[PDB]
Design a protein around this ligand. Structure first.
Ligand SMILES: Cc1cc2nc3c(=O)[nH]c(=O)nc-3n(C[C@H](O)[C@H](O)[C@H](O)COP(=O)(O)OP(=O)(O)OC[C@H]3O[C@@H](n4cnc5c(N)ncnc54)[C@H](O)[C@@H]3O)c2cc1C
Ligand SMILES: Cc1cc2nc3c(=O)[nH]c(=O)nc-3n(C[C@H](O)[C@H](O)[C@H](O)COP(=O)(O)OP(=O)(O)OC[C@H]3O[C@@H](n4cnc5c(N)ncnc54)[C@H](O)[C@@H]3O)c2cc1C
Lengths: 450, 451
C-alpha cells in the first residue's frame, strides 16, 4: 500500500480546504474524489443556484421595475438551455482553478470511490492507501420520501440536470433549498407550487422573516401550500405528475422536486471496519478538534454530528484541522457559534444568531429588547411593485448585546458579513449606534433603529 | 417685538430638520426656517434623485450588458428620460409629505422664507423678527461655477436634475464623487459622456487601488476620461451645442456641460457680520467639538462647518446630538467625526472607511503597516462577456493589525460596508475579521477571507 502523511476522503468543500492547507505546510496529501472536484457546492449547490438566482433577478428587473424607470422593453423570450451552458461553463473554470491550486500544492488527486479496509487503510480502484491521519469529508445526498410514485420526482441534482424549463413545478420542502428553487423558478416564468408540511416555510427563522417571505410569495411569488403532507405521486396518462396530499387535495404538474432534507453519505464507505462511532442518522461523532473516537480519523462538513450544513463551515473546519495537525497549533479548532446565513430567496434573507423566541427562552422575555425597521427599498419604491424590507436586532441584557440580527429585502444578502464580525466582537446596540450611517442604502436601516 | 422661541434652526435641510425634530421631541418650541424646499440638498437635488437614477442606470446595464448571457432575448425599444424624472419627483414628493407629517406631530413651526441675522440672538424673515437663546446655522452649500468666459452656458448639479429630456452628449467637468456619479449614470443610460479632470485622475483622495480600478473600468465600459484638462472657455456655437475649450488646446463639442468642480458654503448674504461669528477664507464657520461658534448661543452643523464632513448622515447626527445636549441635558453628547463610512455611486460603486494605504504609512510608518487585498470577478458578471473586476483592501497598523482602513469597489459593495463600520468603531483587528465565518456565495465574504 502507498503511504501518505494525510488522506482526505471527499474532494468537496471540506476535503479540498483541508488537503490544500495541509500541503502548504509540507504534507504529502492524497485527495480522493469519485465524481467532480468541489462537491455539492461547486457542482450542484451554491454556485449553480446563485447563477440562476442572478438570472431570475434580471427577469424581475425587466418584468417588474424597468417600465417605471422609463424603459420600453420587450422580453421576447428566455432560453433556459443558454443559461445552463453559461452556468456550466463557469463551473468549468472553477474546476481548472482547483486543478491549478491542487497542482501547485503537490496534492495527489485520485479519481475514484474510497472505502475503508481498516482504521488506517482505504481502498480506491483496487489499490490500498494508508496514512497516519485520515479525513472523512464525504458529505450528503438528497432524501427521497418512501411513498408510492416517489421515483417520479427529482431532487436538487436532477433539477440542475434539467436541459429545459419545465412549464409547471411542484417544489416539496420547507427548508432554504426548496424556497430558493421555488423562487428562482417562479421568477423565470414557471408555474410554481411550494408544498410545506406545516404552517409555513423556514420554520427555524424569525417570525418577521417568515411573515414577510409569505406575504411577498402570495403577491408576486410561487403559490404556497401549507399543511401539505405528500401521500402519493400519480403518473397520469398524459405524462404529468399528480401530487396527492394526505389532507385530500392534489396538484397536477410537469416535474416535482423533493427538497425535504439530506442525509450523510456514511453508509457505503465500510465504516464498520474502522471502529468509528456514528449516531442513529449516520452522522459521525467528533470532539471539538474534529477527531472521531478512533485516533487518526477525523471528520468535517455535512456528515459531522452537530455541524452546520454550509460550505464555509466545512472550509474553516478543514483548514483549522490542517493547522492543528501540520502547523503545530494544538488549540486550532472551529467556532460553530454566530455563523451567518443567507438564503437566496425572492427577496433574499440574511440572519445571524438567535430568533426573537430563541432569545426569550435563553434569557427570559423581560430581559430582551427588540428593535425593528420596516421600509421599502428605494430601488422598488419608485415602481408599481412596492416590495417590503424588514430588519430586526434582538438584544439581551442591560447592555443590549445583539444576540440576533435578521433581514429580508433587496441586497440584504450582501450587508450581513460585516455585522457578523461586530457580533463576533460582542457588539451591543450602543456599538451599532456609534457608527455613522451610509445614505442612501438599505444597510443604514440596521444602524438607525430606535 | 421679536417672537420668542427656545430654538431657531436656519436651513431646513438634513442638519436643520434632524436637529429641530429632536429638540422638539424634548418639549422645545422650535422655529425651522427654510427659503426653498424642505429636505434641502439631499432630498431634492442630491442623494435621493441621484440614487433613483443610479438604479435606472443599473437596470440599463442589466439589460444591455448581461441579459443575453443569462439567456434572455430582449428588445430595449427605448428609454424615456421624462418618465424617470416623473417617477423620481413623485418619490421625492412622498418624502415631502412625510416631513410635513413628522414636523407637524412635533409642533415645529416651519417658516417659509430667507433668513438674515439681525444680531447675536435675532434673525429676520419676511419682515418679522424671531429671537431665541439657541440658534443653529445649517444653510448648507451651493455649487461652484468657475469664472471663465461662457461659464453661464454650463449647468451644475441642480440644473442636471432640472433636465426633462436626455442630452445626447455631455461634458462633466470635475474630479469629485459628484462628477463621477453623474458621468457614470449618463454613460450607462445611453449618453455620450466625457469626464474632464484637471490632474491625473478623478477621486484623487481615495486609495490608489480604487482609483486604478475605476479608471480601468471607465476606459473599457464607462465614460471617456480626459486628464490634465483645465477649462479655459465655453463657446456657444451657432447650432445650439456647446464647445468646451481647454488650456492645453483640446476641445469637445457637447449638448450640455455640467460643472461639478466643488461646492462653497451659503454663509454670505445672511448678515453674519452682525453676530460676531467668524468664518475662514472659504466661508466655513469654525465650531468647537459641541458645534458651538465663538459666540454663545450660535451653533452650526453640516456642510458649512469648518473641518466637517459633507454627507447627510453627518449633518443629521451632529444636529441630533446637539439637541440631545441642549434640550435633553446631556452635556457630553457630541458628534464623532472619526471612521465615517463613505459610498460613491459610481459604475461600479465604491465603499471606503478610514485611512488610505499612504495615509496609514505617514501616520504609523511604512514598516508598521500591513496591507491585505482581494481581486475577484463578481459571479453576477463572471458568467457574461462583460466581466467586471472587484477589488477590496484592508489597511492594518500595529502588531495587533488594527484595521485602520477598508476599501472596496465592485457590484453591491455599496451595501456591504455599514456592518464593517460597526466593527471598526469597536477597534477591529485582522484577527476579528478572521473570527467570523464567511457567507458563500457573496461578494462580501472577500473582505474576511484575505490572507
Ligand atoms: C441545492 C443546494 C444549495 C446549496 N447552497 C448553499 C449556499 O448557497 N451556501 C452554502 O454555504 N452552502 C450551500 N449548500 C451546502 C453546501 O453545498 C454543503 O454544506 C457543502 O458542500 C458541504 O461540504 P462537504 O465537504 O461536507 O461535502 P461535499 O462538498 O458534498 O463533498 C463531498 C464529496 O465527496 C465525494 N464522495 C462521496 N463519497 C465518496 C467516497 N466514498 N470516495 C470519494 N469521494 C466521495 C462526493 O462526490 C463529493 O464531491 C447547498 C447545498 C445544496 C444541496
Ligand atoms: C449631487 C449631490 C449628491 C449628493 N449625494 C450624497 C449621498 O449620496 N450621500 C450623502 O450622504 N450625501 C450626499 N450629498 C451631500 C448632502 O446632500 C449634504 O452633505 C447635506 O445635504 C448637507 O446638509 P446641510 O443641513 O448641511 O445642508 P442642506 O441639506 O443643503 O440644507 C440647507 C438648507 O438651507 C436652506 N437655506 C440656505 N440659506 C438659507 C437662508 N438664508 N434662510 C433659510 N434657508 C436657507 C436651503 O434652501 C437648504 O434647504 C450630495 C450632494 C450633492 C450636491
Amino acid at each position: 500500500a502507498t503511504h501518505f502523511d494525510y488522506i482526505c476522503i471527499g474532494g468537496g468543500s471540506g476535503g479540498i480546504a483541508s488537503a490544500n492547507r495541509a500541503a502548504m505546510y509540507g504534507a504529502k496529501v492524497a485527495l480522493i474524489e469519485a465524481q467532480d472536484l468541489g462537491g455539492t457546492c461547486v457542482n450542484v449547490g451554491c454556485v449553480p443556484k446563485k447563477v440562476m438566482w442572478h438570472g431570475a433577478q434580471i427577469a424581475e428587473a425587466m418584468n417588474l421595475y424597468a417600465e417605471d424607470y422609463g424603459f420600453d422593453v420587450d422580453v421576447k423570450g428566455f432560453d433556459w438551455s443558454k443559461l445552463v451552458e453559461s452556468r456550466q461553463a463557469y463551473i468549468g473554470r472553477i474546476h481548472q482553478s482547483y486543478d491549478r491550486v491542487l497542482g501547485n500544492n503537490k496534492v495527489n488527486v485520485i479519481k475514484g470511490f474510497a472505502k475503508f479496509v481498516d482504521e488506517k487503510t482505504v481502498e480506491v480502484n483496487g489499490e490500498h492507501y494508508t496514512a497516519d491521519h485520515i479525513l472523512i469529508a464525504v458529505g450528503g445526498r438528497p432524501t427521497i420520501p418512501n411513498i408510492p410514485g416517489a421515483e417520479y420526482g427529482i431532487d436538487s441534482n436532477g433539477f440542475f440536470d434539467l436541459a429545459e424549463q419545465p412549464k409547471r413545478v411542484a417544489v416539496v420542502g420547507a427548508g432554504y433549498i426548496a424556497v430558493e428553487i421555488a423562487g428562482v423558478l417562479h421568477a423565470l416564468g414557471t408555474e410554481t407550487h411550494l408544498f410545506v408540511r406545516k404552517e409555513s416555510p423556514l420554520r427555524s427563522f424569525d417570525p418577521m422573516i417568515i411573515d414577510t417571505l409569505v406575504e411577498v410569495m402570495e403577491a408576486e411569488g410561487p403559490t404556497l401550500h401549507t399543511h401539505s403532507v405528500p401521500k402519493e405521486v400519480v403518473k397520469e396518462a398524459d405524462g404529468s405528475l399528480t401530487l396527492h396530499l394526505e389532507n385530500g387535495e392534489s396538484q397536477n404538474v410537469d416535474q416535482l422536486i423533493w427538497a425535504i432534507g439530506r442525509h450523510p453519505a456514511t453508509d457505503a464507505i465500510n465504516l464498520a471496519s474502522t471502529g468509528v462511532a456514528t449516531n442513529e442518522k449516520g452522522y459521525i461523532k467528533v470532539d471539538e478538534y474534529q477527531e472521531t473516537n478512533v485516533k487518526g480519523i477525523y471528520c468535517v462538513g455535512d456528515i459531522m454530528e452537530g455541524g452546520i450544513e454550509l460550505t464555509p463551515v466545512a472550509v474553516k473546519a478543514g483548514r483549522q484541522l490542517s493547522e492543528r495537525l501540520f502547523n503545530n497549533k494544538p488549540n486550532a479548532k472551529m467556532d460553530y457559534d454566530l455563523v451567518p446565513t443567507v438564503v437566496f430567496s425572492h427577496p433574499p434573507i440574511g440572519t445571524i444568531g438567535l430568533t426573537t423566541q430563541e432569545a426569550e427562552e435563553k434569557y427570559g422575555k423581560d430581559n430582551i429588547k427588540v428593535y425593528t425597521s420596516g421600509f421599502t427599498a428605494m430601488y422598488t419604491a419608485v415602481t408599481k411593485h412596492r416590495q417590503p424590507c424588514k430588519m430586526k436586532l434582538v438584544c439581551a441584557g442591560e447592555e443590549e448585546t445583539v444576540v440576533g440580527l435578521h433581514g429580508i429585502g433587496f441586497t440584504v444578502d450582501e450587508m450581513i458579513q460585516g455585522f457578523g464580525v461586530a457580533m463576533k466582537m460582542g457588539a451591543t446596540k450602543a456599538d451599532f449606534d456609534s457608527v455613522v450611517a451610509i445614505h442612501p442604502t438599505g444597510s443604514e436601516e440596521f444602524v438607525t433603529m430606535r
